[PDB]
């Protein structure tokens, strides 16, 4: 029979997407520095509109102890530990998961959060002042006192 795993179960790690379908990871490297094993490695790239994303992203699962500190440290909820434990491999080199092996097609355990809806940095589709709890930019040449 299939094994029952609770929703909090710390298993295989994925990178998730936002409700708009774009990857949540802003390549802020907080997961890599919070990893006590140091088995996360990534690099920041930027789109033409200024959106931060990971150029690559790799996890050494042969080193990973599945402690969940990266998911706890993620401020966009991109990286998540999912309830799945079937990860046995023939070669240890195949236990290094690149971004194509981690980026799922959905939001994972957090179905709605979008960090770029809260950030003040302007990306495509969110100009200045269009994020949450943000006023429109008042021009410094305005007539109003």
């Amino acid at each position: 029979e299939p094994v029952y795993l609770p929703p909090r179960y710390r298993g295989r790690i994925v990178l998730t997407r936002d409700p708009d379908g774009e990857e949540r990871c802003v390549a802020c490297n907080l997961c890599a520095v919070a990893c006590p094993v140091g088995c996360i490695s990534l690099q920041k790239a930027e789109t033409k509109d200024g959106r931060w994303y990971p150029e690559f992203f790799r996890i050494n699962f042969s080193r990973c102890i599945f402690c969940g500190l990266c998911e706890e440290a993620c401020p966009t909820t991109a990286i998540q530990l999912t309830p799945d434990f079937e990860m046995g491999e023939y070669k240890r080199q195949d236990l290094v998961y690149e971004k194509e092996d981690l980026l799922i097609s959905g939001p994972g355990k957090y179905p709605e959060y979008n960090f770029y809806r809260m950030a003040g940095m302007a990306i495509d589709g969110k100009d200045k002042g269009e994020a949450e709890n943000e006023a429109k930019p008042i021009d410094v040449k305005s007539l109003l006192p």
């Binding site: 390549a27 088995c39 690149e98 709890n133 006192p145």
Partner: protein, 905 residues
């Protein structure tokens, strides 16, 4: 003075404010608007302490520690509950409008606002309303602008305007909509605009070049290095990640470059990351290029060197002292030639003779800011030695400092000082072939050919002291301005004479020496500064050797049938046709270089040398200061087949393989001991930094921060097995975080500043004895020579005035901070900031030529006809033609040469 902080008695300087005094004692007070170099203004209101009237006072009063003098019998409390509450409140008010941007902010992990938010203890938001937002500006290729993150602390405008003297950055608007930026979109014009990325305590101004390949500060591998982009030798912290050089941070040196770099040294590091660099030894066999490892490259090179009759070595002022000495040992002292031209070498050795025999003390870069009058002769200081231009600006503001000190206004109260000294400033007299960037604060600017600048210098020396040779034919108005200069220089307590080899005239240097000698004869506390051209120009001058012309003569006559070229492209010091013919005549050309130069097509062997990021070595300042630079990273850590060794390592092993037919990859301290044994005038470089056996209580010095990430994944795509940590036998530094970087450690080489609670560039306060002073156990570096007991004689070779002769055109050198240097102009981010190739002409000469502004003229130099578009220069003199030195096709050796057949294409 005596202060009591929280009941603890401290002894401080009574001329300081309480913020700098308490930061010097290791006490933590949050602050934003104060800078050690910019002074106190009291804007941000963050540094509040509670002052009491006496010991038996309980109610107190909140005072601002940066605007309060640390007088005797002072009673303050930092850890008072009301003071702590108000500091948290100030952080909270700043946090009300701050964007939720830390994961997508380049300042994160390096942010002073992050540090002070954590330090005040504010982590709970009770503000529910909207945040103000701002549009961003385009500030050019180097600085990225994000006005949302601003906390309105006014540090940027205070630095850029009051300190750096720039004019295109300001504060606009009012109550809570204050905006810090340019009046319109465009490139920031100041040569010191890069220091905004460390002055700004938030992420408003960030390194765009680093933002292209961003990594957080804890992920960097840092090393203490010396900037290689001119002769001033500013201390830097280059930091790498994944095998490429990522950032140049400033490294504090209380003697040289304290808080600030220039834009060339900060943003022209990108030649290290070029993908066409030599990464492996390559031997030319027919048309084939065979890649070798280190051993067989050394064997083949040694066999070819042993079968040849004479081997000559052409060094460079780019290469370190150790590399040039290793080449000198490999080829022999009499066969070693400096890679610079004869005229450049003559000017360089005259500058060295003036420095270490003229009996006039040459100041450090920090000490330039205390001189009472400045005369700059021929040297475009802003474009060739830019940090000297910044220090000159501070020395010019010294007059307002003295006026404010006369009214008992404290030295940190910068607004009162700038108010008292409104436009009064110390006398500055610059000379150039055209306008400079110091003309805004210059008391006088002289635009003249180099002969006339030298004649003005000789006339100033003659008027100061009649024993100096007299100048005939001085016009009455020029004599009146010479008398103005003489009255300003004679009355100064501390005059400073700045010149250099970039003006292209021996007589300019002689005139500067004459003015300095005349001022010293009157008992004045005169100092002299010489600006060399490259990072190790004075080291190559001290080492000595023949000129490049002699080496080419040896190659052309056939007396030398093997040439080893070290870190030299040979086209910036000689004509390209002659160099190409001479190297094509030789049956062995071996180029030991780290950049793909044009002479590698003729080369029979190319040794992939290491740049300053991948190597250790010593370089000599323009003031004669020996400074060690350490390797940042191992080039072979990620690419296992990369054979990219130090130049001195290559040459020492080549010498060992020539002598005893075995390779010998030596250690750096062995080469340094060889230098200080064979060359006694370079014996100071032994004390530039301690040896590889130096330990802080038994442990090496760490190159990377203690929270370094990705240890078991940064190379996992190459192999899942973790390689051995790279071994550094050369230096006291380790290629890991298993080491010491404590601020209280007894060392002088600090790879990067970090303290617990201070993750920003404000962490340097912990590594200093007093804030804004020196490092706690002294600055790194050592002067090679002291001031001589006896001076020189007066140089009596006074040139005649410039005669504009028909057909000839005297090439006036124009220097650009972005473009004149070779390696930095190879960096791809500089092509946006580079000027277009424009040949400068007088309106009279261009009208005679029938040429307007913008049309392209063709001129032939050394049998090579090239075409450039004409820019009209009003400040130029007739018979001169302006050329940008160091650019594509225009060698800096053309400075002072004549031109033929300048006609419209």
């Amino acid at each position: 003075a005596t202060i009591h902080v929280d009941g603890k008695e401290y002894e401080v300087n009574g001329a300081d404010n309480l913020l700098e005094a308490c930061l010097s004692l290791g006490l933590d007070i949050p602050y934003f608007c104060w800078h050690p170099a910019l002074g106190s203004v009291g804007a941000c209101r963050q540094c509040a302490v509670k002052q009491y009237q006496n010991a038996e006072d309980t109610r107190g009063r909140l005072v601002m520690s940066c605007m309060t003098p640390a007088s005797d019998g002072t009673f303050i409390s930092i850890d008072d509950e009301e003071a702590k509450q108000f500091r948290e409140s100030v952080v909270e008010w700043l946090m009300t409008n701050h964007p939720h941007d830390c994961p997508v902010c380049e300042e994160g992990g390096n942010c002073h606002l992050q540090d002070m938010t954590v330090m005040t203890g504010h982590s709970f938001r009770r503000y529910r309303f909207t945040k103000r937002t701002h549009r961003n500006q385009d500030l050019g290729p180097f600085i990225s602008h994000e006005m949302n993150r601003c906390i309105a602390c006014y540090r940027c405008v205070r630095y850029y305007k009051d300190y750096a003297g720039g004019t295109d950055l300001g504060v606009y608007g009012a109550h809570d909509n204050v905006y810090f930026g340019r009046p319109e979109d465009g490139t920031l014009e100041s040569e010191f605009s890069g220091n905004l990325v460390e002055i700004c305590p938030t992420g408003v101004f960030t390194d765009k070049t680093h933002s292209e390949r961003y990594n957080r500060k804890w992920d960097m591998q840092f090393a203490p290095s010396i900037c290689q982009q001119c002769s001033i030798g500013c201390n830097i912290s280059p930091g790498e990640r994944y095998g490429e050089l990522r950032r140049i941070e400033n490294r504090y040196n209380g003697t040289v470059n304290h808080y600030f770099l220039c834009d060339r040294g900060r943003f022209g590091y990108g030649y290290v990351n070029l993908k066409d660099r030599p990464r492996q030894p390559v031997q030319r066999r027919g048309d084939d290029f065979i890649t070798l490892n280190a051993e067989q490259a050394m064997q083949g090179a040694a066999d070819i060197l042993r079968q040849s009759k004479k081997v000559i070595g052409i060094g460079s002022p780019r290469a370190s002292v150790e590399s040039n000495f290793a080449l000198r040992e490999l080829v022999g002292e009499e066969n070693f030639y400096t890679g610079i031209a004869h005229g450049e070498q003559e000017r360089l050795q005259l500058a060295l003779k003036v420095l270490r025999e003229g009996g006039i003390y040459t100041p450090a870069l920090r000490e330039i800011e205390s001189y009472d009058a400045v005369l700059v002769l021929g040297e475009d200081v802003t474009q060739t030695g830019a940090r000297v231009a910044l220090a000159v600006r501070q020395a010019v503001k010294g007059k307002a400092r003295e006026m404010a000190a006369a009214q008992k206004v404290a030295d940190w109260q910068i607004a009162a000082i700038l108010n008292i000294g409104q436009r009064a400033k110390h006398p500055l007299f610059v000379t150039n072939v055209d306008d400079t960037r110091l003309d805004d604060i210059a008391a006088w600017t002289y635009r003249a050919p180099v002969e006339d600048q030298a004649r003005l210098g000789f006339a100033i020396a003659h008027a100061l002291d009649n024993s100096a040779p007299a100048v005939d034919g001085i016009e009455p108005e020029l004599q009146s301005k010479i008398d103005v200069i003489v009255q300003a220089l004679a009355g100064a307590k501390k005059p400073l004479i700045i010149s250099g080899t970039n003006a292209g005239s021996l007589e300019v240097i002689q005139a500067a020496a004459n003015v300095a000698k005349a001022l010293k004869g009157r008992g004045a506390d005169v100092g002299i500064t010489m600006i060399a051209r490259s990072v190790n120009s004075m080291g190559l001058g001290i080492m000595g050797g023949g000129s490049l012309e002699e080496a080419l003569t040896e190659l052309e006559t056939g007396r030398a049938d093997a040439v080893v070229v070290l870190e030299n492209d040979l086209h910036r010091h000689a004509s390209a046709t002659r160099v190409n013919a001479a190297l094509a005549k030789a049956p062995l050309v071996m180029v030991v270089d780290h950049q793909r130069t044009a002479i590698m097509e003729n080369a029979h062997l190319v040794l992939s040398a290491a740049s300053f990021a991948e190597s250790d070595g010593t370089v000599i300042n323009n003031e004669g200061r020996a400074q060690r630079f350490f390797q940042v990273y191992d080039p072979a850590y990620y690419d296992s087949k990369t054979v990219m060794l130090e130049s001195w390592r290559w040459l020492h092993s080549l010498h060992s393989t020539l002598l005893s037919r075995e390779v010998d990859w030596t250690q750096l301290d062995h080469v340094i001991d060889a230098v200080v044994a064979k060359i006694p005038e370079l014996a100071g470089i032994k004390d530039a930094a301690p040896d590889a056996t130096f330990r802080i209580r038994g442990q090496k010095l760490a190159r990377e921060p203690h929270r370094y990430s990705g240890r078991t994944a940064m190379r996992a795509n190459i192999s899942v097995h973790e390689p051995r940590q790279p071994q550094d036998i050369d230096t006291m530094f380790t290629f890991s975080m298993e080491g010491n970087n404590q601020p209280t450690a007894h060392r002088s080489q600090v790879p990067f500043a970090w303290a617990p609670g201070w993750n920003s560039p404000q962490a340097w306060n912990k590594f200093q004895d007093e804030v804004g002073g020196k490092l706690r156990f002294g600055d790194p570096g050592v002067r090679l020579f002291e001031t001589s007991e006896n001076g020189l004689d007066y140089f009596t070779s006074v040139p005649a005035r410039f005669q504009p002769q028909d057909g000839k055109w005297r090439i006036a050198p124009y220097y650009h901070l972005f473009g004149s240097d070779e390696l930095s102009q190879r960096a791809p981010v500089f092509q946006s900031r580079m000027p277009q190739p424009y040949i400068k002409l007088n309106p009279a000469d261009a009208a005679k030529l029938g040429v307007n502004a913008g049309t392209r003229v063709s001129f032939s130099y050394d049998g090579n006809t090239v075409t450039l578009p004409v820019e009209i220069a009003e400040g130029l003199t007739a018979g001169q033609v302006g050329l940008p030195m160091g650019m594509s096709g225009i060698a800096p050796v053309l400075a002072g040469a004549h031109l033929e057949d300048l006609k419209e294409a």
